[PDB]
Amino acid sequence: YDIQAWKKQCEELLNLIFQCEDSEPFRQPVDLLEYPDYRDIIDTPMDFATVRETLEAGNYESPMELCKDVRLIFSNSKAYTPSKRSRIYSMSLRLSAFFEEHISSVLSDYKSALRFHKR
Numbered sequence: 001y002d003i004q005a006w007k008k009q010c011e012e013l014l015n016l017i018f019q020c021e022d023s024e025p026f027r028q029p030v031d032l033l034e035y036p037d038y039r040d041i042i043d044t045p046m047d048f049a050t051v052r053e054t055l056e057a058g059n060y061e062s063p064m065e066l067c068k069d070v071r072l073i074f075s076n077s078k079a080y081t082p083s084k085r086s087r088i089y090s091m092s093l094r095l096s097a098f099f100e101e102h103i104s105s106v107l108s109d110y111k112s113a114l115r116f117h118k119r
């Protein structure tokens with residue numbers, strides 16, 4: 001029922017994501033010299049360094065907000081990919097599965113802790 005525990009749990013999960021080769025495309029912004037049309041397709045860029053920095057700044061109030069930004073990394077990859085078989089998009093899908101598998105208990109625990117707080 002620790003309503004703060006999500007933050008370290010998210011730091012640890014981000015650490016695991018940064019050890020994962022599948023995250024390499026998603027740890028920094030898209031170089032427009034490499035992908036010149038990227039901002040024609042993607043309105044709101046997001047990467048794992050931005051997520052980590054926002055968490056470390058104390059600018060997430062809840063793991064739900066962190067989860068929204070991580071899911072934006074994946075939806076941006078799906079929207080930008082030219083093919084559902086593209087290397088970088090395929091990496092996004094494995095990393096999304098990994099993330100969702102691990103974030104589910106973080107979200108459940110937080111929400112249960114907030115319900116207990118308000119009981």
Ligand SMILES: Cc1ccc(C(=O)N2CCN(C(=O)NCc3cccnc3)CC2)o1
Pocket residue numbers: 024025026027028029030031034035076077078080081082086088089092
């Ligand atoms: C072809 C295709 C399908 C889906 C995607 C896609 O989701 N992105 C475009 C490419 N991305 C980057 O360039 N990351 C920045 C970067 C810069 C230097 C070193 N590592 C990473 C990630 C986002 O790209």
